[PDB]
């Protein structure tokens, strides 16, 4: 049958890896698109179910996609959630593959807003990466307002009733992205609400600059490769990153790197030291992101970028 959900119709493939089949889809009684997982029945790691209720716990936050179905049908678990547009990693591509420092303080403070709500529903999320987050599509309100997605890595690193922190221990399997991820989970530490900053700071220098110097580097493993690009993240101070770049981005990286595991991070101080690059530089947080003079000013299309 062409319907799953009983108002959820299939509709083209937008992906098949990392996290299952991915189709587009429209709801049958509004014709609102939708983004239809498949995920096999018996398989080695059950992570959509899970999903499901993190979009259902940070349900009504803004750039959380509302989460619509779980199903069963068939040998396949469905969720089915709100369709967006590009991730930033698309593009960052489509742009050449760097940012102008408008759009990238810009796009931090929203990325910086998402993880903390993200924090404040006692949740970490692990998998900082610019391919998770996405802008919405054309006409919408929100087209290039940025969105988080991809919940399967996160974990809940506070009681959700008492608030206390979880133990810090270390000799930790290194799961992830080993371009953005922390110094922390390099060493196998349990990562809390600082890697998660951390991350967003080594993406925002990578928008910035257009690579990582840790990027490219060969090792005979891939756990020895993990080590040369940790070893390169503490070997590379944050001023030789910020190299041509407004210091507030290497101060950010130093601060967060700085915080202690159960501390609360000072969300709208790092939003405060981003937006000040903005003064320094005479620059206004009008919006306006380089995606958006994309093909004479059109944006961003199917046929010519991808
Ligand atoms: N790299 C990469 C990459 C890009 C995009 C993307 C999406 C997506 C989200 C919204 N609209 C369209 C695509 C999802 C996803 C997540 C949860 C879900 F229920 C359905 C789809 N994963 N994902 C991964
Ligand atoms: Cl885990
Ligand atoms: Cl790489």
Redo the contacts with the bound molecule.
Sequence with gaps: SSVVGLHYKIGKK??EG??GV?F?GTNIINGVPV???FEPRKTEAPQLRD??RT?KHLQGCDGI?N?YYFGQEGLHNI???????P?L??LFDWCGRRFSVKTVVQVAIQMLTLVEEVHRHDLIYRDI?P??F?IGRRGATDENNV?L???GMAKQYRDPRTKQHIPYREKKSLSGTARYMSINTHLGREQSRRDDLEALGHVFFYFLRGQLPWQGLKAPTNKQKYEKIGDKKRTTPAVTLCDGLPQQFAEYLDSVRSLPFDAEPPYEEYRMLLLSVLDDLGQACDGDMDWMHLNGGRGWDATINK
């Design positions: 937008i992906g990392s996290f991915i587009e983004a239809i997982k999903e499901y979009y996609p989460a969720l089915v959630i709100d369709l967006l547009g991730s990693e698309d990466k391919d998770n996405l969105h997605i991809d919940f």
